[PDB]
């Protein structure tokens, strides 16, 4: 236990007074060698805690802000009284960190670290002397204007920020995030320029540093690559491809290094300067270090008019060539007929009721407008769209046929989504009837995209070498890759008229291919959303006035914007590659589009020279410019930039910009949930090359998970509360290892968190008894089936109860009751007694039968991701990277091929697991509640194919429990021939459920032993026949511990 040692040492630092006492609370598994639950703390003298210890670190000179480096007047670091004159006009939304942790908490987490490492040995001393020279700059600037005391909900009022500079809080937050990631001398020279210059230059610093990364991935030679097959399976190929670069790229890379010297950066353009002499892959992680560090400057929060002015003001002309727009509109028309040819001819059940298909899946839509609703006696304000339907279905206003206009009378409100170092993107806020019309038709466009080679939904898995590995499979010395960066994709001229009229023309060739009266109707309503968006006005508020701007283009926030933007690229890059073939003769190997970032691999006849690269790039940005789409045409021979991934020289490099101590939107979480987002943003940045200290993170989990009931008492939970596998998990003991503990007091506490895993909310039980909720449930049972049954109607009325957990105040009355019920268990050490099978109860019976021995494995495979940590790179080089991805979606089964066809619901794999192990007449009672007819659910039960479907659901459910497809286990090959020489388990037939879990648990204990220690072990399990039958009856009653904030911990982006 190491977190318990830092927890006791922290409270002896922040409470320096004599009146502070700490009472540890212990507990045991027996009645009468004990692990501790929490640590009490009574401290009374608490005024001026941080402002007294800051003065001993405030030396040197403070930073004087430069006031003539930004174009706008409210982006400079001026005094707030000089910027906002009165307290009535004070906008917090330009500097708000939007995290529930104040600046006075972040300064104690550094001053606690600087005391523990004040007198270390000569290797760890140089890290301390580099993190002290940076903290002198941060402390002496804050101490001049003082420390701003936060609000009760962690905002900053006007009266505490009156005499300070405006961005003092949101600069001291990001600079503490940067100085706690300095490890080498190269990391100290980057952090000094991004701390000094970031005090004045709040506009164009993250753009100048992160600019030359699209160029530098085209200079590094390839010597050995990973490729992928036609089906997505990995291969290793060791060709040699030379990098060819024209003389105008180096005349552009020299321009990017002289823009970085006008801004004042004088030691970041010396590392790129000294790397270009070699152009080597062995020094390239220095060039991705500078690209990853540039995103930690901070967010560019601006006014909504001032950030949507260059986007909404474009020059549309009629001096384009109209001969090129006829082929562009025809190629969009040919795709929509090609996508909906099979679900319209054979009339699918999903298109026949598009009104019901959007109603039962409106929890996937974006948040709409803020509207006043009335649910019985209560009056609530909500932006979720399925709450707008329950108010509109009661008052006699629910008309899904009539689609409202978005012209000058009723404009479209606008929301933003921004990323540091890029421009901002606007998001439409559409009514709730643009989601119902565009859901059953777009879902038929995204099943064709999962079987077509040129789209992005084909190469969409959990791994990252199998998805973006088709870039380098066509690479040779006679080919070139052509990745182009369209600047303003949203409002270009090729998107307003010919894109909406290419879809409308494609839905008129599908109104003559069918014979039902319903499929003509759902293809007419999807056509009606395109004529109304042909002339759309947008609404942007500024000051007193509200501006209405005409905007006939395509923005995000729609439903079709992920599958119809991919059609407009494959029709536009097919027209440009046909105009460039009048000067050259090639053969297009692959085209692959993902939104608005794409590539295309052209294979030439003769060898590629330096003249065929400079003159193809001048025929891409001159053919695009004939269609009024200005682009930055880039061609390369070795490496590209596919979407946020940088494949340079055979290796794949990611970006590591995730802001830990800042956020872009004010989230609706608690502190306990944002202490697991802060940890899971540290594991992501550690795997990509931005290593923050662990002891700064573990200090930040101490200051966020603690909760007080009185102003003098504090409760700090221990390691065994936060690390155990339950609802309340925050972090793990070792970093990349998910451990399931097996001790008689560790299963005793995991069952003790099973009582208060389900709490009730006082808001959702008053909505569910109101009259307008019963009117919404009653009119869904009419459309779902023509009959009336009492079983299906309670099965519907208790399904929209869980849909109200997406509402933000309802999902906060549960979580505020989780932590307030935990405090009665951390104070009273005795708990309750119950029995319920978890995953740890199964592993209690398997672990005493494994015998370990020492073993060795020589390295045989090489590394394709060179920014991974050292203990994970020993696993990959010894057992191999993943070759093929095993699916856990369950759609290969025969019950998930029946639910998806005959109904619109989607049941969770934790729901299909519980019902597949019951009798025949219990699967019947469940399948009718899904919407399946009685004659179909009598077929599947009466066919006895559920007996052979028991093992296709348990295979995909155990892979979800142990998190094999997600986490950091999605890199190692599990069917490798080098893990089977270590696992030696004799085979005993006729029980497949137990033999499967003996080989999946033995494969994890060998991997989790070689990350902790770096040495391999071999296992042997002579499991008896009398213990296999006892474990066989517990493989079906296993229950999982699901949490809402943990479902985001499975994916990276």
């Amino acid at each position: 236990g190491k977190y318990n040692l830092i927890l006791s040492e922290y409270l002896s630092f922040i409470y320096n007074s004599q009146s502070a006492v700490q009472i540890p609370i212990y507990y045991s598994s027996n009645s009468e060698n004990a692990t501790l639950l929490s640590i009490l703390s009574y401290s009374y003298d608490k005024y001026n805690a941080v402002e007294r210890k800051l003065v001993k670190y405030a030396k040197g000179k403070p930073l004087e802000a430069d006031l003539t480096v930004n174009e706008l007047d409210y982006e400079n670091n001026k005094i707030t009284s000089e910027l906002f004159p009165t307290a009535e006009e004070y906008t917090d939304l330009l500097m708000d960190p939007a995290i529930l942790t104040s600046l006075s908490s972040n300064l104690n987490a550094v001053m606690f670290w600087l005391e523990k490492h004040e007198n270390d040995v000569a290797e760890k001393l140089k890290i301390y002397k580099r993190r002290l020279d940076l903290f002198t700059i941060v402390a002496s600037t804050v101490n001049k204007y003082g420390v701003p005391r936060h609000n009760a909900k962690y905002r900053y009022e006007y009266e505490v920020m009156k005499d300070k500079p405006y961005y003092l809080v949101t600069w001291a937050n990001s600079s503490i995030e940067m100085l706690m990631s300095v490890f080498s001398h190269e990391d100290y020279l980057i952090a000094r320029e991004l701390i000094v210059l970031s005090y004045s230059n709040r506009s164009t610093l993250a753009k100048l540093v992160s600019s030359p990364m699209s160029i530098l991935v085209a200079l590094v030679d390839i010597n050995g690559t990973f490729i992928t097959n036609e089906e997505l399976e990995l291969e290793f190929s060791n060709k040699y491809v030379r990098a060819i670069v024209p003389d105008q790229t180096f005349d552009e890379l020299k321009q990017m290094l002289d823009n970085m010297r006008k801004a004042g950066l004088t030691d970041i353009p010396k590392m790129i300067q000294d790397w270009l002499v070699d152009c080597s892959i062995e020094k390239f992680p220095l060039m991705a270090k500078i690209y990853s560090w540039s995103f930690h400057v901070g967010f560019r929060k601006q006014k909504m008019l001032d950030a949507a002015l260059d986007q909404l003001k474009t020059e549309y002309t009629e001096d384009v060539d109209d001969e090129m727009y006829r082929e562009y509109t025809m190629l969009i028309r040919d795709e929509v007929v090609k996508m909906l040819e099979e679900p319209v001819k054979h009339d699918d059940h999903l298109l026949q009721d598009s009104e019901l298909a959007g109603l039962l899946s409106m929890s996937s839509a974006s948040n709409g407008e803020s509207r006043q609703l009335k649910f019985g006696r209560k009056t609530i304000f909500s932006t979720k769209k399925n709450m707008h339907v329950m108010d509109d279905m009661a008052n006699g206003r629910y008309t899904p046929g009539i689609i409202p206009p978005v012209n000058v009378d009723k404009p479209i409100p606008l929301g933003r989504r921004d990323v540091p170092g890029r421009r901002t993107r606007i998001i439409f806020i559409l009514p709730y009837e643009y989601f119902i019309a565009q859901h059953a038709v777009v879902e038929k466009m995204l099943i064709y995209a999962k079987h077509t080679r040129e789209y992005a939904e084909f190469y969409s898995q959990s791994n990252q070498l199998l998805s973006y590995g088709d870039v380098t499979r066509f690479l040779s010395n006679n080919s070139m890759v052509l990745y182009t960066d369209v600047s303003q994709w949203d409002s270009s001229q090729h998107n307003t008229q010919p894109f909406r009229k290419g879809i409308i023309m494609g839905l008129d060739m599908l109104a003559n291919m069918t014979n039902d009266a319903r499929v003509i109707q759902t293809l007419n309503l999807y056509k009606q959303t395109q004529i109304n968006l042909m002339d759309s006005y947008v609404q942007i508020p500024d000051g007193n006035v509200i501006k209405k701007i005409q905007y006939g283009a395509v923005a995000s926030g729609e439903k079709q914007t992920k599958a119809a933007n991919s059609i407009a690229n494959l029709a536009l890059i097919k027209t440009v590659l046909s105009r460039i073939s009048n000067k050259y003769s090639f053969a297009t190997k692959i085209i692959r589009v993902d939104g608005d970032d794409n590539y295309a691999v052209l294979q030439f006849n003769t060898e590629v020279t330096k003249q065929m690269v400079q003159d193809v790039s001048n025929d891409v940005r001159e053919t695009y410019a004939r269609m009024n789409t200005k682009v930055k045409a880039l061609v390369s021979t070795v490496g590209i930039e596919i979407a946020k991934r940088y494949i340079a020289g055979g290796k794949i490099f990611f970006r590591a910009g995730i802001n830990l101590l800042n956020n872009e939107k004010k989230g609706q979480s608690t502190q306990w949930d944002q202490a697991a987002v802060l940890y899971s943003n540290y594991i992501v940045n550690r795997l990509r090359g931005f290593e923050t200290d662990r002891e700064f993170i573990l200090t930040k989990i101490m200051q966020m998970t603690s909760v007080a009931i009185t102003g003098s008492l504090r409760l700090f939970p221990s390691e065994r509360v936060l690390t155990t596998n339950s609802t309340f998990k925050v972090f793990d003991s070792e970093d990349f290892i998910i451990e399931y503990g097996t001790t008689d007091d560790e299963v005793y506490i995991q069952r003790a968190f099973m009582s208060l895993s389900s709490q009730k909310s006082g808001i959702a039980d008053e909505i569910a008894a109101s009259s307008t909720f019963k009117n919404y449930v009653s009119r869904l049972s009419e459309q779902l089936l023509f009959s009336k049954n009492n079983i299906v109607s309670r099965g519907i009325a208790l399904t929209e109860k869980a849909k109200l957990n997406s509402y933000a105040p309802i999902s906060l009355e549960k979580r505020r009751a989780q932590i307030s019920a935990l405090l009665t268990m951390l104070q009273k050490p005795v708990t309750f007694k119950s029995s319920k099978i978890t995953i740890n109860d199964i592993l209690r019976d398997i672990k005493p039968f494994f015998t370990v021995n020492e073993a060795h494995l020589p390295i045989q495979y090489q590394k394709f991701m060179p920014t991974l940590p050292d203990n994970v790179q020993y696993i990959i080089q010894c057992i191999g990277s993943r070759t093929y991805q095993i699916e856990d979606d369950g759609s290969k089964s025969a019950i998930s091929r029946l639910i998806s066809k005959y109904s619109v619901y989607k049941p969770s794999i934790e729901e299909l697991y519980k019902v597949i192990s019951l009798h025949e007449n219990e699967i019947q009672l469940y399948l009718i509640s899904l919407g399946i007819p009685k004659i179909d659910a009598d077929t599947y039960v009466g066919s006895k194919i559920y007996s052979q479907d028991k093992y296709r659901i348990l295979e995909s459910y155990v892979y979800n429990l142990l998190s094999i497809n997600y986490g950091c286990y999605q890199l190692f090959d599990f069917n490798s021939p080098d893990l089977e020489k270590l696992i030696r388990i004799p085979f005993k037939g006729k029980i497949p459920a137990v033999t499967f879990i003996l080989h999946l648990y033995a494969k994890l204990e060998v991997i989790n032993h070689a990350i902790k220690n770096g040495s391999w072990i071999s296992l042997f399990c002579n499991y008896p026949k009398s213990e296999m039958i006892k474990l066989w009856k517990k493989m079906w009653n296993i229950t999982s511990l699901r949490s809402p904030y943990t479902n985001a911990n499975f994916f990276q982006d």
């Binding site: 079983i791 309670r794 099965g795 208790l798 729901e911 519980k914 019902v915 192990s917 019951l918 009798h919 219990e922 009672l925 469940y926 509640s929 009856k1033 009653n1037």
Partner: peptide, 22 residues
């Protein structure tokens, strides 16, 4: 009261019909 709670498991319906092996 969800539907997954009300439907009884296979081991519950195997106890309303009793017999001894030997």
């Amino acid at each position: 009261q969800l539907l997954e709670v009300l439907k009884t498991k296979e081991e519950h319906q195997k106890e309303v019909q009793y017999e001894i092996l030997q």
